[PDB]
Structure formats: C-alpha cells, structure tokens
Design a protein around this ligand. Structure first.
Ligand SMILES: N[C@@H](CCC(=O)O)C(=O)O
Ligand SMILES: N[C@@H](CCC(=O)O)C(=O)O
Lengths: 546, 534
C-alpha cells in the first residue's frame, strides 16, 4: 500500500507591514530621495516593451509628462502592436508550464527579494519616479511605491505559501491532496495611473500563483511601473512570466480578448472600460479554452458622514486629507461630506481656515507642498468642467478654491463646494480631482439623511462616519453596510493598509476581490484535487444488492 | 465547529434503514404530490401545469407542479429582496443552525423519505440515493456550516489606535440557483450555500427532480429557514433565465447543468451589465468527458470494477462518469473478457421493486432519445464496434442497457462528446506508445473535469500525474472517476467543465460573500500636515 505520490510539508512565513519612514531633516531616506529626485531632473528614460528578455521598440512612440511640469517628458515609451502582443502571449504560454510546476515557495522568493530591494536600495528610486512621473508628494509616494507595494509582495507571498497547507481530509484507504494550479492560459493585467503599487500587485499576484501575465501599465505611470518591472526581473522573475507591454487600451483589450488562451483579466480603472472588457469576453466566449476570470476594482463617490456628536477637529483634518491628498485622485477619496446643521458653522469655519493654509506646488522642489498638479490634460479639462458647473448650477456655491492654471503643470487648487441639493450630479459623479462637495442636513433628519448617503450614488467603495455616540455608530454601521466595502469609524476614507484593511467594494465599484487580504490570491488559482487509493477495489456490486 | 462525514449505511437485510426505506418506497407507490411554487409562505399555482414522471415507470406521475411565470418570478424577487437585510444581519452561527438542523433531520427521521423520493423520481438505486440525498447533502450542510463559522474567524491585523474587523456580507441583490436532475444534493447546495452566507435565492429546481427537491425545500423551512430566503420557483428554463438576467437586482447565478446554457446566461448578464446594481457573480459546474487511463502495471480487477461503476452507475448520468477508457494492448484480452462477462450480469430494472438492480432507466424521453442517437452512431461508424449492450426500450421506462464500444479512432466524436448515458468507449493503445497516448488523453477533448490513472509503478504514476495536471480537476490514482466526497475531494474542473469553484471544499462559500472591512480609530486624528513638510 505504498504511497506513489509523496507530499512535502508546507512551511510558514513571518511578515509584518513595512514601516513608513519619516523623511525628517538630515535623515538618510530624505537625503537619498533628494538625490534620486535630482537624478531625474531633466531626464527622459526611453522605456521599451519587454517580451522575454528582449527590449522591443515599435514606431508608436508615446511620452509620459511630469504632471507639475509638463514640459518635462519623464519617459519616452511605445505601444506594443497587435503582432507584438500576440508574440508576447505565445512566449508566455510556452513558459507557463515550468513556472506553474515550480514550488510555491520558489515563486514567493522572487517577490520577497523584490520587496527587500524596494524597502532598501531601490526605495528612493521608486519614490522619486512616482513623485516626478505621477505628481505625488513624498508621503504619498512613500505609502504607495514603497509601503503598499512591499506589503502586497510580502503578504501575498505569506498567503500563498500558507494556502498550500489548506488540505482536505484523508480517510483510509485513500490520500487526498489539493494542488493549487495556476490558471491554464495567460492573464492580462491592466493597471491605473494613481498607484504604483496597484500595477505591481495586478501583475505580481497572478504571477505568484503560477500564472503568466501580459502587463499593460498606465501611460501616466510608466516611469515608476518600469522601475518595478526591472526590480522583479532582477529579483529572479524568469523571462516570459510577466511581459511588459504598454499599449493602446482598446488595442490591448481587443487582442487579449481575441485569444483562445485568455484565462483572466486583472483590471483596475474606469467602470466603462471594465464593462467593455467583460462584454468582449462574453462575445468571444465560444473561442476560449476555459471561462476567463475577470477581476475589476473601479471608482467610488465616497462619503464622510458627520453626526452631531463628532469630534470637529478630526472631521476637518480627516476630510481635508481624504478629499485633497494626491489631488483627490483616489478611488477612495472623500468627495461628499454630510454635515449636521448644528456643527456646520464650526466645521465650515475650520475647513475654510485650514484650506487657506494648503500649499499646492512642485512636490520635488518644495516638500512643504500638500498636494500637486493632477495627472494630465484630460483630467485637468474634466475637473475644469466641473468647476464651471459649480458656478453655473443654482444649487452649488464655491466656498473655497475654484482656481486652476495649466500653464506649467496641471494645477487645480483644492475646491470646497456646498450643494443645497443632495441629488445634484456633483454629489453622484466621480470627478477624480480635488473637489469636495458639502451637503448640510438638519440634525432632526439624520436617519433620513443616512438613507440618502446609501442611495444617492451608484458606488460602494469607501465611507466614514464621524460620531462619538455608540448607538449612532452602531445604527450608521448597520444602515451603510452596503454603501462601503471599506468603512471607517472616526477615521478618513483613504489609506487602506495591506493586511489591516483589505480593500475593495461592490455596487458599481467592482468585483470586490479584496486585494490586501488573504483571499485575493484564490482568484488566480484553479485547484486540482488528487485522490490516491492504496488498496485494490472490490467487486462492482454492493452488499445490499444480494 | 467540529464536523465529520455522514456514514454511508449498508442497508443489510433487517437493518433499520432498509426497513425504513422499504416503507418509504411503499408510501410513494402510486402517489402523485401536487407541488406548488412557494414565495414566502404562499403556495402559488399557475395554469402552466407540468408533471414529473418516474423514469423506470413513466406512466407513474410522481409529481404535478407548475411553472412560475415572469410575473410570479418578479414578485418572488421583490419579496426576497425585502427579507434580505434582516437575514444578512443575522449572526453567521444563527444561519448555520438552520443547516445543521436540516442535516440532522436528513440523517435520521427524513432519510428514508429523501432517498425514496430520489429513487422513484430520479430513478436512482438505493446506494445512489444514499450517497446523494443523504450523505452528500448532509455533508454540504454540515461542512459549509463549519467553513462559514470558521470564516468569521479570519480577521485582519489591528494596530493601535485602530481596530479592524471583516464583516462577511452576503451579496447585495438576489442569487438565482439553477439545479440539475442528477443529484438531489446539488440542488440543496446550490440554493443552500448562498443562503447560508446571507443571500436570498430564487431556486429553480430541475423538473425531473422536483419531488426530492421539494422535500429538501420543506426540510429547510421546517429546520427554521425564514420565509423569502429561498423561493421555490420551478419554471421554464429560458423564461427563468430571461427574467432573472433582466432584474437590476441580480447579484449571482449558481448554476449546474449544460455548457451551452451556462454560456447563454453569461452572455445575457453581459448584455445587461448596465442595468445591474453590481456585477453579478456566475458559478457554473458543467460537463466532462472523463477518462480512465490504464497502464500495463494496473490491477486488472480494480480497473474492471472501478470502470463498470464509473461508466454505468446511475446510468452514466454524472458529470464525473468515465466515458473513455484507454487500455494497453498487453492487458486488453483480460480487460475485454472481464468487462464483457461482468456486463452480462448487470441488472437494469426497477430499483424500488428489485434491490438487485445495478442501475435503472435514464431520466427522461429527451435523454433516452439523445443516447439512442449515440448508439445509432456507434452502429454506423466504421471505427466503432459495439462489444456488448446497445439495446434500449422506452415502452415502460426509459431503459438503456449498459453499452461497451471499442473505437479504433482515439479522436472519434464519441471519444469527445458528453453522452450522459451508460455508454463506455474503449481505445486500445500499443504498449510502446504509452506516452503518446497520455498526450492524447490530455489533448482529445474540450473538458477538464475528472479522470483516473490505474498503475502500480511509481514513476509512471508521477509522470502521468504531471502530464494530466490540467486534464482533470478531480484526478484519481487507482480509483474510479466518480464519487467525490465532501471535505475529502472538493469537486470541479476547468477547461470547458466550468468555473471550478470547488464546492465540497472550504473556499466555495467565498463566492457568496462580498466582504466589508471596518476600521475604527479610537483617538482623535490630529493635524492634516505631515512632519516632513515643516
Ligand atoms: N486602496 C487605496 C485606494 C486605491 C485606489 O485609489 O484605487 C486607499 O484606500 O486609499
Ligand atoms: N461530484 C459528483 C458528480 C456531480 C455531477 O455529476 O454533477 C461525483 O464526483 O461523482
């Protein structure tokens, strides 16, 4: 009855969150970052597509601009054509079996090594490239290109190594074992401009699980994205496991959804684009060798809801940060603030005072900058249109800000607007700019207003309640259960931390697969269960049949 | 929560379970149950009357039921949605209790009933009903309850001054559960697992399994399931799919059935994406063209009994059933002779009246006709030869004898296409072409569900295991390709065989929850500036 299949013991991994650095004067990390920023000033990196180990150039040349100094081309790159994308698919597929057969721990090692490189010798580089290329301030780059990305890599490695210990029951005469296979085919990873870390996770998590990936990074985050890619390769990622293939969005989507070998799309970006990809997969369902798995994290129209018992100062600082950090360019950013009439004079006064102290400027040159320019000309134009809507709409009034200037960078001052209409389009539609809308509700209608918070928008991503009354917190928590997948009590609606607040939400905000938590990796494995029986079978008949 | 698998009873002469089952069978002889749609606690009849027939005696209408129309389905959605918030707010343990109670009822006082209804209504023999309506269903309920209660213990890291907690919310909207004729347990799981996780469900049971499905439904209600959590809504297939995919509140489809129907539902959801409040989650377990691959070192008796069971139990009406057998030339005289001899002894007949029956009639006239077409194909094809069986007679029941066919063409359509009948095709390969044949096992079909390798050579087993990694989601070494046991062999496969969500394992329930993480901060927030800015 000897076992012909032998299964090895599964190991464990101890990881903790990457500490956030202070960047105090004279500190090594501040000195290193300043030097890295200096290294990037006046520089343009020519970034190729990478298929296997080959650097490939097409004639479709594109540029990434520095948002706060758009005269500065930080990168020249190119769009993969359909031929190159299909070549990348073929080469990835040819590399997949070997990679899938590698022990999980060996794949995890690549990501653990990459995390250590990001933590130490490459921290300043990835921070600086995120600052200059995406317009982030020091701390916004630090929580993203360093801490969050490092955390994704370490925590997903832990989750993946430990997943292999999740095994079924065996009863004599048989032994059962689950093999956590990668998906058969390739995964397309499509990442957004606003977080360097998201690109690394979208391509990296499926790769960890034995998949091969075509990664289309965001044009407006190309510089930092390529830095991450190179680090993964230096950390030991074999060729053809992640293909670095910037591309026109529609072209990329058309190509990957036309391949019989597509097994997954890991997407973060706009709802309409995700829906389009979902429809393309459905249209082509008959050609696929298996049913592709779509994961999408999309936008939000997120709320801070204030109860009369709230700590005012916390409401003010938490809301200023949530609404305006990184120019409000977060799917988690607060864009609607609900305030009870009893607290509005206090909160309005404080918001306006603090607003006047917010510095908008060049984040590389002036570390006093709270936030900088928005990402590109398209974002600037959209935000400008909303500011113009605020002036024209009889239900809207601009309380603070409203100015913008795109002469040097895509600069928009933080803007606070009051709406007298809780259903105004500005209360519903995601702007992705530093534009906060305030609705003041009578204290006596708090319950009815909680219903408005829940029903007004199509989104379900983040939200916060500020209140010190326990019963109120319990009630609001119950009522807003499906209004936010990441819900905050007396804290701001942004800044989820890996392993602490797994991130994502439903309604129109996506598929809610909770990257940052222990279950996300399950989307990228298709388990096989093996039963080995160690004794001969008996007759085909059963005893009761006699 | 601690749970173990339900014992499979032996049904020996004079045993309590055999006495009880015989009584329950007698109770159903000549009976027709009028089964209403159930919306909330309302029993509703439409004019669209339908009948479930006993497969082995189709003159016996075992149930009269009706199809819910679009109006009734929409009322069922409305009522379910209004009950969902309270149900979802219940502690996981309180929801689990309903399923644990139902499991105990199925194990004991209701075991004979659900077995008998599965036998008479779906044509199962004693043991096939036992492993299904009792053991597997009981196991789904107990194991999923354990998995769910334990899932609540999966919580994130808290760091002062904040506390983090995950709330495993049910999906917002309603789930449509669409279940197949062939296992009573699958219907219970498809509707029950989402309900356990705080969802509300429109359950469209299979027409041809209506009697046993309603028995399970009633047991759930008696076990404490509140009204409007699971709506019992038999319906015309296209009408049901059209209606649920047209609702802005659809949040999931839990489907087990044909590939084309699943694909159609997937396309309907995609067409209507803009209408839905959230992205619906589709789970589909579909068919297979499952293999038994034999190496020359195999134990022949195990190959023979395992293959006879896998190919022919329940008339081969399993997504896991072996329908292609690959045998090396060196063992073929043995395996052929033994298969044909044992074949002559297989009793096909009335499973209620004759416990000697190995398997009975196939499920309905449509199945009978499809299987007959394949038998006629076998008689026509120059590369196919019927070695044994091939007879069929639908005068009294939908009776098809077990059929064993040899193909000289490893790529014949019969080697590729799912028949869902008692039809085994054998391909004999030269011993020295064993590796080439292993590749054929993997490359021939579109499916990836179950398969077995019979071999007593470690190196061969290791090689075959690696080579067939994606040819089967449930892979067996020296055992038959059917009979997955909850908690032991979580079930499912990829390629064309479905989404592979592995019901029977700990992760399946994750498809039916959409987590929320709550962070509470216990100290004031301070300034919006950062120290490095000064
Ligand atoms: N998870 C990030 C937001 C990610 C995004 O904007 O897409 C946060 O909590 O702030
Ligand atoms: N899981 C069952 C098959 C279920 C089905 O036929 O759909 C088995 O292993 O036999």
């Amino acid at each position: 009855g000897s076992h012909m299949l032998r299964w090895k013991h599964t190991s464990s991994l101890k990881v903790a969150n990457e500490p956030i650095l202070a960047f105090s004067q004279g500190s090594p990390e501040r000195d290193a970052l300043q030097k890295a920023l200096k290294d990037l000033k006046g520089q343009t990196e020519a970034i190729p597509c990478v298929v296997g180990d080959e650097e490939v150039w097409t004639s479709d040349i594109q540029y990434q601009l520095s948002p706060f100094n758009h005269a500065h081309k930080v990168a020249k790159f190119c769009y993969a054509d359909k031929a190159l994308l299909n070549r990348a698919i073929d080469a990835a597929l040819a590399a997949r079996k070997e990679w899938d057969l590698k022990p999980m721990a060996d794949r995890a090692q690549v990501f653990l090594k990459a995390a250590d490189m990001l933590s130490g010798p490459r921290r300043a580089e990835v921070l600086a490239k995120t600052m200059v290329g995406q317009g982030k301030t020091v701390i916004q780059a630090e929580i993203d290109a360093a801490a969050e990305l490092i955390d994704f890599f370490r925590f997903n490695a832990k989750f993946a190594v430990e997943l292999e210990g999740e095994q079924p029951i065996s009863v004599p005469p048989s032994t059962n074992h689950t093999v956590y296979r990668g998906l058969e085919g390739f995964v397309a990873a499509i990442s957004p401009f606003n977080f360097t870390a998201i690109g690394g996770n979208l391509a990296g998590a499926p790769a960890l699980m034995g998949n091969v990936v075509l990664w289309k990074p965001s044009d407006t985050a190309m510089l930092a994205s390529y830095a991450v890619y190179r680090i993964l390769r230096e950390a030991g990622l074999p060729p053809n496991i992640i293909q670095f293939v910037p591309a026109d969005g529609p072209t990329f989507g058309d190509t990957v959804t036309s391949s019989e070998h597509l097994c997954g799309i890991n997407f973060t970006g706009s709802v309409p684009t995700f829906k389009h990809l979902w429809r393309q997969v459905a249209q082509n369902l008959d050609r696929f060798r298996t049913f592709p798995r779509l994961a999408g994290e999309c936008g939000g129209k997120n709320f801070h809801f204030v109860h009369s018992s709230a700590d005012v100062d916390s409401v003010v600082s938490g809301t200023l940060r949530s609404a305006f950090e990184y120019g409000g360019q977060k799917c988690s950013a607060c864009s609607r603030l609900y305030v009870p009439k009893s607290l509005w004079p206090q909160i309005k006064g404080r918001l306006l005072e603090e607003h006047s102290r917010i510095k908008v400027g060049d984040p590389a040159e002036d570390f006093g900058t709270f936030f900088s320019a928005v990402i590109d000309a398209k974002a600037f134009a959209r935000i400008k249109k909303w500011l113009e809507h605020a002036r024209s709409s009889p239900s809207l009034s601009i309380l603070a800000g409203g100015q913008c200037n795109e002469s040097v960078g895509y600069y928009v001052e933080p803007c606070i607007i009051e709406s007298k209409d809780p259903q105004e389009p500005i209360m519903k539609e995601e702007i992705f700019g530093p534009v906060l809308t305030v609705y003041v509700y009578p204290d006596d209608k708090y319950r009815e207003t909680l219903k408005l918070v829940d029903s007004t928008t199509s989104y379900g991503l983040t939200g916060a309640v500020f209140a010190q009354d326990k019963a109120i917190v319990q009630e609001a928590t119950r009522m807003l259960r499906n209004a936010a997948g990441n819900f905050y009590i007396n804290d701001k609606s942004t800044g989820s931390v890996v392993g602490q607040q797994p991130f994502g939400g439903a309604r129109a905000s996506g598929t809610n697969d909770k990257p940052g938590g222990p279950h996300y990796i399950l989307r990228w494995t298709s388990p096989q269960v093996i039963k080995e029986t160690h004794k001969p079978l008996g007759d085909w008949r059963y005893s009761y049949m006699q």
